[PDB]
Amino acid sequence: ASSRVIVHVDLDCFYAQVEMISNPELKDKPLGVQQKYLVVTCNYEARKLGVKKLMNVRDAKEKCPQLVLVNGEDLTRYREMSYKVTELLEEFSPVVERLGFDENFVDLTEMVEKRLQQLQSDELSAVTVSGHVYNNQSINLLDVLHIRLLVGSQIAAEMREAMYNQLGLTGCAGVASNKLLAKLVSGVFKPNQQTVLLPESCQHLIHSLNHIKEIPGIGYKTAKCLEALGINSVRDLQTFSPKILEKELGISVAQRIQKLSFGEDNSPVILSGPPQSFSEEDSFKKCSSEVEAKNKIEELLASLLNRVCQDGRKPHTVRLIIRRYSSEKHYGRESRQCPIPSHVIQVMTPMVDILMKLFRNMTLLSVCFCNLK
Amino acid sequence: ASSRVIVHVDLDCFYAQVEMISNPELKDKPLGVQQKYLVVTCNYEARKLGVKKLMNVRDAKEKCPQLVLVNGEDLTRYREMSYKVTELLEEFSPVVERLGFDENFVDLTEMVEKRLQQLQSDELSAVTVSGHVYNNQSINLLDVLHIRLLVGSQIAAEMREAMYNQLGLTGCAGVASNKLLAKLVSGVFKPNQQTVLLPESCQHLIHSLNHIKEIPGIGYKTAKCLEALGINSVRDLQTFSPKILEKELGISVAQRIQKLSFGEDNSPVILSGPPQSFSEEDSFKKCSSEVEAKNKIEELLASLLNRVCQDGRKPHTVRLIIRRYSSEKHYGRESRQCPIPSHVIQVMTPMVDILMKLFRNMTLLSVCFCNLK
DNA sequence: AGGACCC
DNA sequence: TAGGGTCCT
DNA sequence: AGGACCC
DNA sequence: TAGGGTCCT
Numbered sequence: 216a217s218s219r220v221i222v223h224v225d226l227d228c229f230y231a232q233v234e235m236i237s238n239p240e241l242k243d244k245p246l247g248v249q250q251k252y253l254v255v256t257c258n259y260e261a262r263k264l265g266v267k268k269l270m271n272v273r274d275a276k277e278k279c280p281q282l283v284l285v286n287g288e289d290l291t292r293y294r295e296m297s298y299k300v301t302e303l304l305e306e307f308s309p310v311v312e313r314l315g316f317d318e319n320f321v322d323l324t325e326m327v328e329k330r331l332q333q334l335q336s337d338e339l340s341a342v343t344v345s346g347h348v349y350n351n352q353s354i355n356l357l358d359v360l361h362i363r364l365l366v367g368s369q370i371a372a373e374m375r376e377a378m379y380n381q382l383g384l385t386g387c388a389g390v391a392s393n394k395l396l397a398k399l400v401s402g403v404f405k406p407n408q409q410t411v412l413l414p415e416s417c418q419h420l421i422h423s424l425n426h427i428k429e430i431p432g433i434g435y436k437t438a439k440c441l442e443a444l445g446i447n448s449v450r451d452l453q454t455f456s457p458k459i460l461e462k463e464l465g466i467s468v469a470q471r472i473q474k475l476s477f478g479e480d481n482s483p484v485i486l487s488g489p490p491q492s493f494s495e496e497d498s499f500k501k502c503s504s505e506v507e508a509k510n511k512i513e514e515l516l517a518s519l520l521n522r523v524c525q526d527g528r529k530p531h532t533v534r535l536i537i538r539r540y541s542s543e544k545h546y547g548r549e550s551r552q553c554p555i556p557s558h559v560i561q562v563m564t565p566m567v568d569i570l571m572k573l574f575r576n577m578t579l580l581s582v583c584f585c586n587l588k
Numbered sequence: 589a590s591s592r593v594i595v596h597v598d599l600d601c602f603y604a605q606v607e608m609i610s611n612p613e614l615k616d617k618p619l620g621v622q623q624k625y626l627v628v629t630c631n632y633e634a635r636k637l638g639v640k641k642l643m644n645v646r647d648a649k650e651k652c653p654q655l656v657l658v659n660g661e662d663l664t665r666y667r668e669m670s671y672k673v674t675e676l677l678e679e680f681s682p683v684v685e686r687l688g689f690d691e692n693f694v695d696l697t698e699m700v701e702k703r704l705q706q707l708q709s710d711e712l713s714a715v716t717v718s719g720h721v722y723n724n725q726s727i728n729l730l731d732v733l734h735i736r737l738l739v740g741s742q743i744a745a746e747m748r749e750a751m752y753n754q755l756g757l758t759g760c761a762g763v764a765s766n767k768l769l770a771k772l773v774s775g776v777f778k779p780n781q782q783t784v785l786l787p788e789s790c791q792h793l794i795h796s797l798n799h800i801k802e803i804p805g806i807g808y809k810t811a812k813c814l815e816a817l818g819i820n821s822v823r824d825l826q827t828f829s830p831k832i833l834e835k836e837l838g839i840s841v842a843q844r845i846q847k848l849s850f851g852e853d854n855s856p857v858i859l860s861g862p863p864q865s866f867s868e869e870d871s872f873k874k875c876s877s878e879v880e881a882k883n884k885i886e887e888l889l890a891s892l893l894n895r896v897c898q899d900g901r902k903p904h905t906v907r908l909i910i911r912r913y914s915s916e917k918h919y920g921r922e923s924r925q926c927p928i929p930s931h932v933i934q935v936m937t938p939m940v941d942i943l944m945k946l947f948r949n950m951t952l953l954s955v956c957f958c959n960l961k
Numbered sequence: 962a963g964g965a966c967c968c
Numbered sequence: 969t970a971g972g973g974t975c976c977t
Numbered sequence: 978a979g980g981a982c983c984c
Numbered sequence: 985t986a987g988g989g990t991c992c993t
C-alpha cells in the first residue's frame with residue numbers, strides 16, 4: 216500500500232455544456248452562463264473572443280458584444296448532471312471523491328494492478344499510453360511505475376468515452392501518482408483531452424506554476440500571508456525555513472503546504488457519497504428591508520423541501536444565513552443554527568416559524584439543511 | 589414503535605466503592621476520595637457524619653475529623669470498572685448509553701416485549717414487581733403499561749444482581765417510560781435499591797423537585813436565566829408563556845426544557861460505543877510559570893500514549909488546553925487544536941514538539957486526543 | 962475555538 | 969473546586 | 978458560529 | 985462578484 220495511480224476528471228465549461236445540450240441552437244455560438252451580473256462560465260467559442268470565466272456581464276459583452284447569455288441561477292440541472300457523472304465513475308471503482316459540481320478523483324490503484332495481473336509476460340511490452348504525456352517525457356516500458364501510469368491513462372480514456380457515450384459530456388482527465396499532481400496535470404491540455412504525468416516530470420510541472428496561489432490548498436488568505444513573507448514562487452516556498460513557517464501559520468497549515476510545494480501529497484481519495492448539506496441562496500443587493508423579507512425565506516424553503524425530501528434521509532438541523540451593506544466587509548456572513556423538532560421531521564407551515572424566530576435572534580439570504588440521517 | 593421501557597442504572601458512591609473493593613480495610617470506615625482539595629465523593633458511612641459530595645477537605649474533616657481520605661486523581665481504575673459495567677449491561681441489550689463513569693441507560697423495550705410473548709395467557713396474572721413502586725402507587729395487572737414496567741423492574745433486578753455477582757458492585761436502578769423519568773426515579777431510594785415509576789405518578793415525581801435546576805438538561809446557565817424571569821418551580825416553567833421563552837433562549841433550548849418540565853422527553857437511548865476522546869489533566873494552582881512548564885506536557889503524554897494505544901483506533905487530532913489566574917473568571921479555558929501528522933500516527937519525541945509549538949501560539953494544563961478512527 | 966451541559 | 973466526557977454553534 | 982478553502 | 989459545497993477550530 217505505497218505507490219498510487221489516481222485520476223482527476225474535470226469537465227469542460229460545465230454549466231455551458233449543460234445549456235448547449237438542452238438547446239442545441241446554442242452550439243457553435245459564443246455562450247455565457249449568467250448569474251446576477253456575473254458570467255460564471257462560457258463555452259470555448261466565447262473564450263476565443265476574450266470572455267474569461269467569472270467576468271462581469273459588462274466586461275464580457277464589450278469584449279464580445281455578440282455573446283449569448285442564459286441564466287444559470289437555478290442549479291438543479293447542473294446538480295443532477297453532476298451526480299450522473301460521479302455515479303458513472305463509481306461504476307469503474309467505488310471510491311470517488313467529488314470536488315465542486317464538475318471534478319471527481321478516483322483511486323485507480325486496485326484497478327490498474329488487477330489489469331496488470333491479467334496480461335501475460337509478453338503483451339506487457341505492447342502497453343501504450345492514451346492521450347498526452349506531460350512534458351513530452353519518454354516512456355520506459357521496463358519502469359513498473361510508467362507501466363502503471365499508462366494503464367491509468369487507458370482507464371481514464373475509457374471513463375471519458377463512457378461519459379461521452381452515456382451522458383453526452385466531454386471533459387479532461389489527469390493521471391498521476393497523488394491527487395495534487397493529477398489535478399494540476401488535468402489542465403495542461405485544456406479543452407477535451409487527457410495528460411499523464413510520469414514521476415521524472417514532477418518538479419517540472421510544479422515549477423511550471425507562476426504563483427503559490429495556484430497550488431490547490433493555498434487560498435486567498437495563506438497566499439497573502441506568504442507574500443508578506445517574500446515567498447512568491449513555488450521554489451521560495453520549497454526553500455523557505457520550515458520553523459519560521461511552522462511558527463507563523465500553525466504546524467498544520469505550514470507542514471502541509473510545504474509538502475505540496477514539492478509535489479508531495481499523501482491525502483487519500485475519500486468516498487463522497489451523498490451530500491452532507493442542501494442549501495439554496497438568493498442575492499438581491501440592497502433589497503431586504505428587514506421584515507418585508509421572510510417571504511423570501513418561504514421561496515428557498517419550497518425547493519429545499521422537495522430536494523431534501525427526494526434523497527431518502529431527513530435533515531435534523533436547519534440554518535439561516537445573511538449578509539449586509541456599507542463598505543467592502545470582504546468577509547461577513549452570519550447565521551443561526553437550530554435543531555429541527557422531531558414531530559416536524561415526519562410541513563411548510565411551522566418550518567417557517569422556526570426560521571422566522573431564528574431570523575429574529577438575528578444584502579443576501581439562504582437556507583441550509585444539514586445533519587442528515 | 590411508541591411506548592418505551594427504559595432503565596437508568598446509577599452506582600453507589602462509585603469512586604469510593606472502587607477504593608473499598610481495593611482495600612477491604614476501608615469498609616465500615618467513613619471514607620472520602622480526594623482530588624486536590626476536593627472530596628469528590630464519600631461512602632455512605634461518611635454521609636452519616638455529614639460529609640456531602642464535593643465538599644472541600646476542610647469542611648469535610650471538621651464535619652467529620654475521623655474521615656479516611658484516599659487520593660482519586662488518577663482515574664484509571666474507575667475508568668476500567670466503568671467500562672466493565674457498561675459491557676455487562678450491553679450483554680442484556682446492545683444499545684447502552686453512558687452518562688459519566690457510573691450511569692448507563694438501556695432501552696429494555698424489545699427485551700420486555702419478547703419476555704411477554706413467552707408467558708402463556710395465565711402467568712400474566714402472577715407478574716410482580718421487583719423493588720419499590722414510586723409513590724407507593726397501586727398496580728393494575730390489567731394495564732398493559734404497568735405490566736411492561738414491572739417486567740422492566742425485573743430486568744433491572746437481574747442487571748443489578750449480575751453487577752453484584754460479576755463485578756462486586758452495588759447500585760440503584762430506575763425504570764420508567766423515557767430517560768428523564770428513569771433517571772429522576774433512580775434516586776428516590778438512594779443507597780442500593782431500585783424504583784419503578786407507573787404513568788399515573790409522573791406529575792407527582794416531576795413536582796417533587798424543588799427547583800428547575802434539578803431537571804437533567806437545565807444547567808447552571810439556563811437556570812439563572814429562568815429565574816431572572818420569575819420561573820422558580822417546575823410548575824412556573826410548565827405554565828410559563830411558550831413565546832416569551834421561545835423568544836429568550838432559542839426555539840431549541842426553550843421548546844425542549846418546557847417538555848421536560850412536563851416529564852416528556854422523546855430522546856432515544858444512544859449506543860455510546862468506544863470513547864470519542866481521551867484526555868488527561870493536571871491542576872496545580874499558580875505553578876505554571878510559562879516555560880518551566882512543558883515537562884508537565886510530557887507527563888500527560890506518557891499516560892495518554894498508553895491509553896489511546898490500547899483501544900485499537902488511533903487519534904487523528906491533538907489538543908492543548910489551559911487556564912490562568914487573577915479574579916474569578918467563572919469560565920475561561922483556552923485551547924489550540926491541530927492534526928496529528930500521518931507519519932506520526934504509526935513516538936514521544938516529535939509529539940512533544942507539535943504540543944510545544946501549539947503551546948506557543950498560546951492555573952492548569954491538559955492534553956486531549958480526539959477524532960479517532 | 963468556545964459554549965453549555967452531565968457525572 | 970477534580971478530572972473526566974458528550975454534542976452544538 | 979465562523980473561518981478557510983474548493984469549484 | 986453567483987450559488988453551491990467540504991472539513992476544521
Ligand SMILES: Cc1cn([C@H]2C[C@H](O)[C@@H](COP(=O)(O)OP(=O)(O)OP(=O)(O)O)O2)c(=O)[nH]c1=O
Pocket residue numbers: 225226227228229230231255256257268315316317984
Ligand atoms: C470556480 C467556480 C465555478 N463555478 C461553476 C461554473 C462552472 O461551469 C463549474 C465548474 O467550474 P470549473 O471547472 O472551474 O469551470 P468550467 O468547467 O466551467 O471551465 P473549464 O472548461 O476551464 O474547466 O462550476 C461557479 O459557479 N463558481 C466558481 O467560482
Ligand SMILES: Cc1cn([C@H]2C[C@H](O)[C@@H](COP(=O)(O)OP(=O)(O)OP(=O)(O)O)O2)c(=O)[nH]c1=O
Pocket residue numbers: 598599600601602603604628629630641688689690968
Ligand atoms: C458529579 C461528579 C461526580 N464525579 C465522580 C465521583 C463519583 O464517585 C462519580 C459518580 O458521580 P455520582 O453518581 O453523582 O456520585 P456517586 O456515585 O459518587 O454518589 P451516589 O451514591 O449519590 O450516586 O463521578 C466527579 O468526579 N465530579 C463530579 O462533579
Ligand SMILES: [Mg+2]
Pocket residue numbers: 225226317318
Ligand atoms: Mg474545474
Ligand SMILES: [Mg+2]
Pocket residue numbers: 225226227228229317
Ligand atoms: Mg471544468
Ligand SMILES: [Mg+2]
Pocket residue numbers: 598599690691
Ligand atoms: Mg450518578
Ligand SMILES: [Mg+2]
Pocket residue numbers: 598599600601602690
Ligand atoms: Mg452514583
